[PDB]
Coordinates of C-alpha atoms and ligand atoms in Angstrom, one line a residue:
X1 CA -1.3 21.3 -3.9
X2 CA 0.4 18.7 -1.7
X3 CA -2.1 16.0 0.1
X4 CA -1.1 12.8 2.2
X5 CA -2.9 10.4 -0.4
X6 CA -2.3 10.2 -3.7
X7 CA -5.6 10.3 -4.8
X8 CA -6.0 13.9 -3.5
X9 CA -2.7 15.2 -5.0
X10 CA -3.6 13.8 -8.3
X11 CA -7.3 15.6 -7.6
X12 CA -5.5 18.9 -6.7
X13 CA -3.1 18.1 -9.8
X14 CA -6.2 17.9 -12.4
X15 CA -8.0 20.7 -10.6
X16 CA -4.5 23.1 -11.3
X17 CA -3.2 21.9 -14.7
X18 CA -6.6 20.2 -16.7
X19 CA -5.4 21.1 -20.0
X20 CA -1.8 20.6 -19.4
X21 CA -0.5 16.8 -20.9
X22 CA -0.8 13.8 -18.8
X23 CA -0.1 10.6 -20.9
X24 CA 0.3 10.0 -24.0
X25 CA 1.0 6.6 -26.0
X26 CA 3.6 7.1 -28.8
X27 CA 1.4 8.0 -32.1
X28 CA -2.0 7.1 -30.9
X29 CA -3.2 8.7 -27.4
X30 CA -2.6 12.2 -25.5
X31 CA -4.8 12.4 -22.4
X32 CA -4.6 16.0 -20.3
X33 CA -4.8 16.0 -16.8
X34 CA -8.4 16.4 -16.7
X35 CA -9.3 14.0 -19.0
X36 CA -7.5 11.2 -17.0
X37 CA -8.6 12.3 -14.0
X38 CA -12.4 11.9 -14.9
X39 CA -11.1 8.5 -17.0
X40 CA -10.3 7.5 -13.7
X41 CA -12.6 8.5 -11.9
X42 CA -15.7 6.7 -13.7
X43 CA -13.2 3.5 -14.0
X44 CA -13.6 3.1 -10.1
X45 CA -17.4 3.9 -9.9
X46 CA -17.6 1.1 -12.3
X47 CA -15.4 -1.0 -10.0
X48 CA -17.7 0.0 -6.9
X49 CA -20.7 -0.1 -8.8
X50 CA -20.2 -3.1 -11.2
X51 CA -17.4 -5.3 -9.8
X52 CA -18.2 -5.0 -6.1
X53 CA -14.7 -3.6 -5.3
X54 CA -14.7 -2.6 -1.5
X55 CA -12.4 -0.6 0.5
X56 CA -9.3 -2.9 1.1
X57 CA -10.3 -5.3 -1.6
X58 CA -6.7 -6.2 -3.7
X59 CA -7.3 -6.1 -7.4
X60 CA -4.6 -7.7 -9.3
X61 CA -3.3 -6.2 -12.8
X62 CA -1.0 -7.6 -15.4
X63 CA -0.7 -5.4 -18.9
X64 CA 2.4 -4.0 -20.8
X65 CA 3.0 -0.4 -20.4
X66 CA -0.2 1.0 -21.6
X67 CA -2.8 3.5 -21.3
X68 CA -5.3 1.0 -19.6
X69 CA -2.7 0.2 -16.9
X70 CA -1.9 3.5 -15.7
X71 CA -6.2 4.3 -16.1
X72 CA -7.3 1.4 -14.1
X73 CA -4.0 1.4 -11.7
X74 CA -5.5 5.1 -10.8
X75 CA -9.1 3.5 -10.7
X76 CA -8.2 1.2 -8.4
X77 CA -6.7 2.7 -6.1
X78 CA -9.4 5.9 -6.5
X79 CA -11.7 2.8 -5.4
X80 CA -10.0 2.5 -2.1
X81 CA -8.8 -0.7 -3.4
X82 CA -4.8 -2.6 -3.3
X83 CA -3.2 -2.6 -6.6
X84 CA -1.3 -5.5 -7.1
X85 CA 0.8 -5.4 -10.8
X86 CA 1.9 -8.6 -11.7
X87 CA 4.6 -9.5 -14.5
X88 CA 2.5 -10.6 -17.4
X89 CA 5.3 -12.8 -18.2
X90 CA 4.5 -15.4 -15.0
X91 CA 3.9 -18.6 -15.9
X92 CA 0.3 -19.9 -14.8
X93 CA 2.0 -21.4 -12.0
X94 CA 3.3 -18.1 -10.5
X95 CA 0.1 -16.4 -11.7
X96 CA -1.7 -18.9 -9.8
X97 CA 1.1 -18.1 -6.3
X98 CA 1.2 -14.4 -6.5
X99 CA -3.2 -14.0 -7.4
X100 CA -3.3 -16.1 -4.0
X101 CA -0.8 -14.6 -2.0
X102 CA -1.7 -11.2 -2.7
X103 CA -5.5 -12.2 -1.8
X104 CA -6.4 -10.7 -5.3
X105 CA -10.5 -10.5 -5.6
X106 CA -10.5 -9.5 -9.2
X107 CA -7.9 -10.5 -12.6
X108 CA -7.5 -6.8 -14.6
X109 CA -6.1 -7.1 -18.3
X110 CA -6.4 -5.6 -21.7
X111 CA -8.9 -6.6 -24.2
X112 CA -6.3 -9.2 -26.0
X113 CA -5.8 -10.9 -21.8
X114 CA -2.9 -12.9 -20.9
X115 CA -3.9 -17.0 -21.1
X116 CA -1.3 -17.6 -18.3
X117 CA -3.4 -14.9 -15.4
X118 CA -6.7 -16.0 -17.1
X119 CA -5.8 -20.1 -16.4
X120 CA -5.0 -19.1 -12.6
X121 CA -8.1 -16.9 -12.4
X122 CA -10.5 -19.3 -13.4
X123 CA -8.4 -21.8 -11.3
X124 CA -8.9 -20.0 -7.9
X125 CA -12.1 -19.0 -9.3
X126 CA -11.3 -15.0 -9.3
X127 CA -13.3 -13.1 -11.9
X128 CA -11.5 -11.5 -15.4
X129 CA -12.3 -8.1 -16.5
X130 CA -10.8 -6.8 -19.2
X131 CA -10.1 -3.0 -19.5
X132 CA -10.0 -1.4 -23.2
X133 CA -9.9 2.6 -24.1
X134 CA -11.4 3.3 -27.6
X135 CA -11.7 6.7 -28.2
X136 CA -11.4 10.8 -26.8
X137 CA -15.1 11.0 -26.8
X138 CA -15.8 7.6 -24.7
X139 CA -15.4 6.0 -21.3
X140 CA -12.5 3.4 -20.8
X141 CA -14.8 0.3 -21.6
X142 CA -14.7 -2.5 -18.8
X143 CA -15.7 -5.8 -19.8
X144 CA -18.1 -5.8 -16.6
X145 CA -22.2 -5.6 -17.2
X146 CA -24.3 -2.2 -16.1
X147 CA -17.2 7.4 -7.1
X148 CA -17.6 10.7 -6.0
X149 CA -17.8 10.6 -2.7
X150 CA -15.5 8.1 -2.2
X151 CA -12.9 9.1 0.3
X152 CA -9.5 8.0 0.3
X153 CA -7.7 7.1 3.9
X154 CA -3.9 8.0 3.8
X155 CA -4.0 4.6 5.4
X156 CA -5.8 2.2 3.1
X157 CA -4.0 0.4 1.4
X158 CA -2.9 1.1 -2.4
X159 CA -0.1 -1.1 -3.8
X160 CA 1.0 -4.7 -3.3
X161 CA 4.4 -5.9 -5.0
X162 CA 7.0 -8.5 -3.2
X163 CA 10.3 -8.6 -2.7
X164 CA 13.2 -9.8 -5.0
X165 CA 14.7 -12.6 -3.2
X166 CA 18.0 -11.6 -4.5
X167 CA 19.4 -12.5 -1.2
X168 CA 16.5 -13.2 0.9
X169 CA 13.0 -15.0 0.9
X170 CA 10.5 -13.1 -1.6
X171 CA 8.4 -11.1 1.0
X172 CA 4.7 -9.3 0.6
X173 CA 4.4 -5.3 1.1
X174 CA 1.9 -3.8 1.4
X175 CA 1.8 0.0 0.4
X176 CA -0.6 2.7 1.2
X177 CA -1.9 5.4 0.0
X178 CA 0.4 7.6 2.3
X179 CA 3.4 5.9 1.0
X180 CA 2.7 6.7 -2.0
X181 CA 1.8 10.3 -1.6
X182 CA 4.9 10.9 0.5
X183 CA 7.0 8.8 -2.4
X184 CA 5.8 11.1 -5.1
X185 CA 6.4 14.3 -3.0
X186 CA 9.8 12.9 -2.4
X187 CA 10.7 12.4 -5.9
X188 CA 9.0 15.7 -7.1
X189 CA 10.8 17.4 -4.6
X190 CA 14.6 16.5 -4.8
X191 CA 14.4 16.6 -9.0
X192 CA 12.4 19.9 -9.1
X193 CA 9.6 18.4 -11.1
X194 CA 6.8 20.9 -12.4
X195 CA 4.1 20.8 -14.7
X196 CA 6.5 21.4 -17.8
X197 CA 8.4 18.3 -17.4
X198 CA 7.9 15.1 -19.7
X199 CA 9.7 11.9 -19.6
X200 CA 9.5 8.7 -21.7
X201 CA 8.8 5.0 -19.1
X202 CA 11.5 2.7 -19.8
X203 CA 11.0 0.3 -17.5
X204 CA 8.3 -2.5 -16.6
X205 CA 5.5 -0.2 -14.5
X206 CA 4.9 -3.5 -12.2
X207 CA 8.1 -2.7 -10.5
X208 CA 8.1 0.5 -8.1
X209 CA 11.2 2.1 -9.9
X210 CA 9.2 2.7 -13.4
X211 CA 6.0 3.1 -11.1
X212 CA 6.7 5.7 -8.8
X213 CA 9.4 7.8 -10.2
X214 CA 8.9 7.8 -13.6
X215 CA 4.9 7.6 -14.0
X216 CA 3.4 8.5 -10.7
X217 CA 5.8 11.5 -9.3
X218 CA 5.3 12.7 -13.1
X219 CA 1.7 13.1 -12.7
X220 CA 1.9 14.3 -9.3
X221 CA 3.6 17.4 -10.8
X222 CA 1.1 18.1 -14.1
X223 CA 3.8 16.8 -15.9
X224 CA 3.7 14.6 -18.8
X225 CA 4.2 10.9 -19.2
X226 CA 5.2 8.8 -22.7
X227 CA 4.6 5.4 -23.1
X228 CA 6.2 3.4 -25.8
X229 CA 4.1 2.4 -29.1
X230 CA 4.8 -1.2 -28.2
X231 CA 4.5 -1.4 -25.1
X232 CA 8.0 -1.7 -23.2
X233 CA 11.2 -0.2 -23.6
X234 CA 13.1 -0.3 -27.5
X235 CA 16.3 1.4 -27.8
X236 CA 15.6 2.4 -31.5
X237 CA 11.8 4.3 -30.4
X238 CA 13.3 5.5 -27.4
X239 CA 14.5 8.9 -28.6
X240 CA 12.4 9.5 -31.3
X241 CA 10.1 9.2 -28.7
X242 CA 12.1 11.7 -26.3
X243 CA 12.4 14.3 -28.7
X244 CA 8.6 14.3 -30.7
X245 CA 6.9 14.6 -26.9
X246 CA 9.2 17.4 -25.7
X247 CA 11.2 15.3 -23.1
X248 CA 13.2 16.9 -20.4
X249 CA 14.5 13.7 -17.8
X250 CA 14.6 10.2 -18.1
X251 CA 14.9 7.2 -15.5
X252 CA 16.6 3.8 -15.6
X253 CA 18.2 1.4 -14.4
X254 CA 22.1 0.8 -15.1
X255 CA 21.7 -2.1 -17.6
X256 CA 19.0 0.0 -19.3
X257 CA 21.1 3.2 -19.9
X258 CA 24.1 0.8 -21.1
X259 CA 22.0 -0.4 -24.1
X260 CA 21.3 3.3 -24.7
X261 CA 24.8 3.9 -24.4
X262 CA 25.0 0.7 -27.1
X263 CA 22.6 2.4 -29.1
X264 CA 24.2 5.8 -29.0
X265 CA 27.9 4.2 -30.4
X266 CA 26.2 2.1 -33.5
X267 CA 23.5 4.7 -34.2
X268 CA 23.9 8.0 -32.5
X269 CA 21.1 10.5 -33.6
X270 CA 22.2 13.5 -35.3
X271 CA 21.2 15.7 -32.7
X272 CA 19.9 15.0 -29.1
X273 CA 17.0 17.2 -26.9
X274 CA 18.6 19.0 -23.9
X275 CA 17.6 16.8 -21.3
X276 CA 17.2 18.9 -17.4
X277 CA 18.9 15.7 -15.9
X278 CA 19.2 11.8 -16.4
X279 CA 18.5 9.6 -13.4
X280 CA 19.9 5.8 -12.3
X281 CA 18.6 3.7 -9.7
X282 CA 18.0 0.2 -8.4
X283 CA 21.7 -1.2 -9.0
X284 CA 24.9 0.4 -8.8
X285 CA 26.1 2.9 -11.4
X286 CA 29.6 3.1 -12.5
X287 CA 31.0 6.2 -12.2
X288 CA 32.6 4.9 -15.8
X289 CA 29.1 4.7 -16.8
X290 CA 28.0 7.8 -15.4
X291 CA 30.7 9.8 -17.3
X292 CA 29.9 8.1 -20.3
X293 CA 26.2 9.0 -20.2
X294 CA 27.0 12.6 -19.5
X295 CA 29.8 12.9 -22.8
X296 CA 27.2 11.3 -25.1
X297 CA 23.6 13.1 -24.1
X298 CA 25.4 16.4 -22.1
X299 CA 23.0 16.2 -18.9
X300 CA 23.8 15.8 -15.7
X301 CA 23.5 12.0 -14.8
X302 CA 21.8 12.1 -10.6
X303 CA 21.8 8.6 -9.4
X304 CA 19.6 7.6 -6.6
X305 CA 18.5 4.6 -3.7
X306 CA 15.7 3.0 -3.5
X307 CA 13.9 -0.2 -2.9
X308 CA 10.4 -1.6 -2.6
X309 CA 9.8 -1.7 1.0
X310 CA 10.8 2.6 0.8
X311 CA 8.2 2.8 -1.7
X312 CA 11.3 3.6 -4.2
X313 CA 13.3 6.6 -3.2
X314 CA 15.1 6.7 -0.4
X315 CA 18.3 8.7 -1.6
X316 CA 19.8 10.9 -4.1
X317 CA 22.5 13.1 -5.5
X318 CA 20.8 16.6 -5.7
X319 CA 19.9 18.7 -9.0
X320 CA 23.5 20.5 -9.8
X321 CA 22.0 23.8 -8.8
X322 CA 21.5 22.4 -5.0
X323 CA 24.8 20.1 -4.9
X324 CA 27.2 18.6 -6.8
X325 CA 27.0 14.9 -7.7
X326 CA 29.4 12.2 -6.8
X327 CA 30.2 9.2 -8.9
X328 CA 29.9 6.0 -6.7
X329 CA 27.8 7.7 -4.7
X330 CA 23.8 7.6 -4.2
X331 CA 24.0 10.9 -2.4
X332 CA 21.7 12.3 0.5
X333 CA 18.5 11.2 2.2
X334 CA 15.2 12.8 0.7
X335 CA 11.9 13.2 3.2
X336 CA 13.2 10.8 5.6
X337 CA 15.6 9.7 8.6
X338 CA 18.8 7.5 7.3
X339 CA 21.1 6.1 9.8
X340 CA 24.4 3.6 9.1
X341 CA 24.0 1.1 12.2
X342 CA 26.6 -1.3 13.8
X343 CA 24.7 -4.9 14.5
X344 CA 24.2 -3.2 18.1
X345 CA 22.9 -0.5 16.6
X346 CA 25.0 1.8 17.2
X347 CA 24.6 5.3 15.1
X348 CA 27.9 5.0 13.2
X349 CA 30.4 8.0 12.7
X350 CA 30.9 9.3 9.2
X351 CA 33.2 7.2 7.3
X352 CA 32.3 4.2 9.0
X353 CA 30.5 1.1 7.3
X354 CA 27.2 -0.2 9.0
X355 CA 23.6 -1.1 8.0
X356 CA 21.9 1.7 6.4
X357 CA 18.4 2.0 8.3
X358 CA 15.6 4.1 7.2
X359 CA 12.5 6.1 8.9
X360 CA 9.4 7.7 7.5
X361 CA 6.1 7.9 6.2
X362 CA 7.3 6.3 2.4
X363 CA 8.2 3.4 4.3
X364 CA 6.1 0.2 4.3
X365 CA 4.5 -0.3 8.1
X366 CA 5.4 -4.0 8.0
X367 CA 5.4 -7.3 5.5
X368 CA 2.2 -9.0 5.0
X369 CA 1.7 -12.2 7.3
X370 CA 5.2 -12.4 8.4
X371 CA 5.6 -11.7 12.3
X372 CA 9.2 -12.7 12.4
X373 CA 10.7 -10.7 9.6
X374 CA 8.8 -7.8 10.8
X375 CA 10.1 -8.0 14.2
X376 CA 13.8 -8.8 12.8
X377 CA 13.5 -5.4 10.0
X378 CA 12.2 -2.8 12.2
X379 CA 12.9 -1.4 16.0
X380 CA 11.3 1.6 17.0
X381 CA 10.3 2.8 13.5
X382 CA 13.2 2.0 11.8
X383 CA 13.6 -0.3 8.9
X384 CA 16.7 -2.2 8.3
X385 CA 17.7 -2.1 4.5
X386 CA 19.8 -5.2 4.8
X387 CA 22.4 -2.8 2.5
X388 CA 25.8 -1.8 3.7
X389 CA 27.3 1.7 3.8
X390 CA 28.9 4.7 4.9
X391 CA 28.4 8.9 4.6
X392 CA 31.3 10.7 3.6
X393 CA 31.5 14.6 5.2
X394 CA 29.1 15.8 3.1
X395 CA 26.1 13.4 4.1
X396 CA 26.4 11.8 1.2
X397 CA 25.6 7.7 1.0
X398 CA 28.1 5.9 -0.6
X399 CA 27.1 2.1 -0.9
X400 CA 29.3 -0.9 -0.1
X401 CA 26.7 -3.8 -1.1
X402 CA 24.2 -6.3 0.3
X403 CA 25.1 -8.2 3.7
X404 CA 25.0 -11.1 2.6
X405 CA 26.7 -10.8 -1.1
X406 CA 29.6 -9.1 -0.1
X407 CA 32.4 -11.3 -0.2
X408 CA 34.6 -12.8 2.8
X409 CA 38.1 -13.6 1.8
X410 CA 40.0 -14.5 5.4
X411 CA 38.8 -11.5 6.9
X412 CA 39.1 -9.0 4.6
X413 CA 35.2 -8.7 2.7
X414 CA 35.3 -7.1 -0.5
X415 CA 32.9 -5.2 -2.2
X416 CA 31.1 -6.3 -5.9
X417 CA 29.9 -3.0 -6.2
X418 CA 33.8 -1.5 -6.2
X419 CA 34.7 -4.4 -8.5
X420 CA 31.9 -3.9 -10.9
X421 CA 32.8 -0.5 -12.0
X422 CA 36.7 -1.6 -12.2
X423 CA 35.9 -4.4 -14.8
X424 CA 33.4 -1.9 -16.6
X425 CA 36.8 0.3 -17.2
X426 CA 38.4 -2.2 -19.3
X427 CA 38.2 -1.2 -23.1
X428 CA 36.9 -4.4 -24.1
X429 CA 34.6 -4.9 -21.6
X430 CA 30.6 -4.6 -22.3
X431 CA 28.8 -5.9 -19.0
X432 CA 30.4 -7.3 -15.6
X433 CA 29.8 -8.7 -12.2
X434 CA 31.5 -9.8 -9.9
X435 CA 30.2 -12.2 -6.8
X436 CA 31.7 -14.5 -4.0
X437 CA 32.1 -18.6 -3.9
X438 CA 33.4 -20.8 -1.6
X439 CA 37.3 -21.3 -1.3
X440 CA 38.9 -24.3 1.0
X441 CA 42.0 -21.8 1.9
X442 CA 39.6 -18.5 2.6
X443 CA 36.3 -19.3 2.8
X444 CA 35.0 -16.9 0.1
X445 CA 36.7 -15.9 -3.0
X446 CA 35.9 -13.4 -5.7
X447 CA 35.3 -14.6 -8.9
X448 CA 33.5 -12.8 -12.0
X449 CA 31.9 -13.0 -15.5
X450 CA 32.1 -10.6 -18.1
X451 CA 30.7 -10.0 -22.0
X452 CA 33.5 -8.5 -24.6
X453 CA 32.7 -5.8 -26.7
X454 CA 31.4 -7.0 -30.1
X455 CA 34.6 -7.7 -32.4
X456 CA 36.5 -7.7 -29.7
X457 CA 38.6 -11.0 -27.8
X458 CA 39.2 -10.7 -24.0
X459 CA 41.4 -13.3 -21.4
X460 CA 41.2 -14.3 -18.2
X461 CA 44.2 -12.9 -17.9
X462 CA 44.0 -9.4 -19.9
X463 CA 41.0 -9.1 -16.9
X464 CA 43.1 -10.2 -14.2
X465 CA 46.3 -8.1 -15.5
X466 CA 43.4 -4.8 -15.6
X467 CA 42.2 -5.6 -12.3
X468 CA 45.9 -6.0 -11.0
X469 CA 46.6 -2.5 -11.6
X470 CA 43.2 -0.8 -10.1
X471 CA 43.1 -3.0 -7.2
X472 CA 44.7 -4.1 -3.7
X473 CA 45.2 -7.4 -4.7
X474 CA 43.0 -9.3 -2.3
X475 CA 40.2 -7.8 -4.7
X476 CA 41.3 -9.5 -7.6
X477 CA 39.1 -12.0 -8.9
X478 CA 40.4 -15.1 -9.5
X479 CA 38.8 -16.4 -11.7
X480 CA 37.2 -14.4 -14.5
X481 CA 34.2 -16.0 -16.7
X482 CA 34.1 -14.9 -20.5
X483 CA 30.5 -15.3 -21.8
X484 CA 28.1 -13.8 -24.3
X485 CA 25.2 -13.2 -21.7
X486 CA 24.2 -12.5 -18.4
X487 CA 20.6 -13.3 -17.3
X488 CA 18.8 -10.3 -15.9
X489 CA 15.7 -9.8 -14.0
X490 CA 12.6 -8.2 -15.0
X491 CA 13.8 -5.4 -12.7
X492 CA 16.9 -5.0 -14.6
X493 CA 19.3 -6.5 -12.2
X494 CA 21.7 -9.2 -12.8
X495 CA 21.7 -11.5 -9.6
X496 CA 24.9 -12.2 -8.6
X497 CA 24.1 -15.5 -6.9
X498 CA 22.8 -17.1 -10.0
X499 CA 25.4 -15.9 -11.6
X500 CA 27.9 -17.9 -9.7
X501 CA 25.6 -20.6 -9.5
X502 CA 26.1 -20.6 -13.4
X503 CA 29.5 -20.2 -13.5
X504 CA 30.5 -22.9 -10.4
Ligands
LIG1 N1 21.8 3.1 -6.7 C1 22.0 1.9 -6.2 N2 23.2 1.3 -6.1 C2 23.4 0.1 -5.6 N3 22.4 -0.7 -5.2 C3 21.1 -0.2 -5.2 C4 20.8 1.1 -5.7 N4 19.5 1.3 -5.6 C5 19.0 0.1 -5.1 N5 19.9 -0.8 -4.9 C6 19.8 -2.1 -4.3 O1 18.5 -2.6 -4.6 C7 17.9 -3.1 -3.4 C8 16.4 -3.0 -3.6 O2 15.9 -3.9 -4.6 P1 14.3 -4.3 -4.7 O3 13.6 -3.6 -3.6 O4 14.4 -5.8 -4.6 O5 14.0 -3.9 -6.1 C9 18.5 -2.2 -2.4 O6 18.2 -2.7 -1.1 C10 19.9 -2.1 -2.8 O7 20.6 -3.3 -2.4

């Protein structure tokens, strides 16, 4: 059943399990494989036939988290066409930056649109379709007037996103249709997926976290896919939703499963489904977190490594039936090399803190139109993550942070990530980050932000006096931020340089 294009696995997917549940939409829809499959397939000969999509054309697409996206996501790519999702929360500004960028031929939305895409569309003068399933008995309806032996390439390309600019310059990468297939095999692989697994998206499907784990390694397995009634992610729906379509893993990020967690204390359900395992990625996850998650939901809580340029996955703690999993850790490489690199590059020792550097076929071949930071991120296959970390003995990755956020006091550089999950101990404490400013006397010092529990009061120096007695003291932050929020991105991170920012 495996291929090296994703277009091909999902064929040999459809071909295995038609009848078996693909997608469903919470009350309303419940495609099967087969039905998708041939949704998708008459979507792109209507994009080849209709609007003149060509092989390597990029077709951009902003919707919520619907049964259109993930239809003409497949279409397009079927088509031998880019993907390129876009936020449809952009303004028409970044609409107008991100439809250029991406060299975006055609604007794909729902029925209702999105004003913001439509305005930079017509702008740049790239034509709207709007994509709109009815009914079981008819073809998804494309706004476009009146495939088969299409062939997909393992190397044309399939999905477009950019980079987060967290700590660097938002950069363009381009994904192929290898990637992708070698993603989902990945993921499929390490979590055991088959045809009798179902999970509910909570997460944005514009992002590669929601995208490839939870909707497209699903589907590469026959197993089934839920999508919220509204559209995105609501803590009350989400396990109504979990337990009516037979649920048996869910994905998230850390911020995500700590309003679950939210959820769980002011309304837990009177009984829960027995989940196979629950999955974290994207930012770190606090082993306080971790063991809260298993106590309330009683599954084993795997969290994995991943970023956009690895096509998501790059490595995770193992099913318990393979390996134990370690709190603070992101466990072992799937499907690919992973090496921790001194700045000569060096292959470092277990134990010993360096660049974590990655090599295989999940892993973008370079970023679009930019010679330099192609030349500075890869040698001789190998792409540097910019992230800092170590294996223990077992081969297992424990992360230390970002280069460049990691925090300099005289010397001594101190990890967020370590501090993050001490703050998240403290009984009062809801959300926490900590991040590095400038100090006269030692360059860098740590400082940090965090949100009490409802009902609750918190000091500076109840934090402190907590952080005192978990920490070498040079780790203490010294100055601790009580506020009621902490901006997130779409992707579910806080950034820790706005934060300070914010705070300074
Ligand atoms: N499990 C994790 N723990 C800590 N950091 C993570 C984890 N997964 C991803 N990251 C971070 O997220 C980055 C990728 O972000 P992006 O590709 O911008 O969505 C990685 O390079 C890491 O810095």
């Amino acid at each position: 059943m495996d291929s090296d294009t994703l277009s091909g696995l999902l064929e040999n997917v459809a071909k295995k399990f038609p009848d078996r549940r693909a997608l469903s939409v919470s009350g309303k829809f419940n495609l099967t494989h087969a039905r998708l499959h041939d949704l998708i397939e008459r979507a792109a000969s209507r994009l080849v036939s209709d609007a003149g999509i060509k092989p390597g054309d990029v077709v951009a697409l902003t919707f919520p988290n619907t049964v259109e996206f993930v239809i003409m996501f497949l279409a397009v790519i079927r088509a031998r066409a880019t993907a390129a999702p876009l936020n449809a929360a952009y303004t028409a500004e970044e609409f107008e930056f991100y439809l250029s960028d991406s060299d975006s031929k055609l604007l794909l939305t729902s029925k209702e649109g999105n004003a913001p895409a439509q305005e930079a569309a017509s702008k740049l003068k790239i034509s709207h379709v709007t994509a709109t399933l009815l009914d079981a008995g008819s073809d998804l309806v494309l706004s476009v007037a009146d495939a088969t032996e299409l062939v997909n390439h393992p190397d044309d390309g399939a999905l477009f996103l950019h980079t987060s600019g967290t700590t660097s310059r938002p950069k363009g990468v381009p994904l192929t249709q290898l990637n992708l297939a070698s993603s989902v095999k990945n993921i499929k692989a390490v979590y055991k997926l088959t045809e009798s697994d179902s999970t509910v998206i909570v997460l944005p499907l514009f992002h590669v976290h929601g995208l490839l784990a939870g909707l497209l390694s699903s589907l590469g397995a026959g197993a089934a896919v839920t999508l919220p009634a509204a559209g995105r992610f609501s803590a009350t729906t989400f396990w109504p939703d979990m337990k009516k379509y037979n649920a048996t893993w869910y994905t998230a990020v850390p911020t995500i499963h700590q309003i679950i967690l939210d959820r769980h204390a002011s309304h837990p359900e009177t009984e829960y489904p027995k989940l196979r395992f629950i999955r974290s990625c994207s930012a770190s996850l606090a082993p306080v977190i971790l063991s809260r998650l298993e106590e309330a939901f009683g599954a084993p809580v795997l969290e994995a490594y991943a970023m956009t340029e690895a096509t998501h996955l790059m490595s995770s703690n193992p099913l318990p039936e393979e390996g134990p999993h370690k709190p603070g850790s992101v466990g072992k490489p799937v499907g690919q090399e992973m090496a921790i690199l001194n700045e000569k590059g060096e292959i470092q020792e277990p134990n010993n803190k360096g660049e974590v550097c990655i090599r295989g076929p999940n892993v973008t071949k370079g970023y679009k139109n930019n010679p330099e930071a192609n030349k500075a991120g890869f040698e001789f296959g190998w792409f540097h993550t910019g992230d800092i970390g170590y294996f223990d003995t077992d081969g297992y990755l424990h992360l230390v942070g970002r280069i460049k956020e990691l925090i300099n006091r005289g010397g001594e550089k101190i990890s967020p990530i370590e501090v993050d999950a001490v703050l998240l101990t403290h009984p009062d404490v809801s959300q926490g980050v900590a991040f590095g400013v400038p100090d006269e006397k030692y360059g860098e010092e740590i400082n940090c932000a965090v949100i009490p529990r409802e009902g609750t009061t918190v000091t500076e120096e109840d934090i402190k006096a907590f952080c005192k007695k978990n920490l070498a003291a040079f780790k203490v932050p010294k100055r601790v931020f009580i506020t009621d929020n902490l901006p997130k991105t779409a992707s579910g991170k806080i950034q820790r340089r706005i934060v300070a920012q914010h705070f300074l």
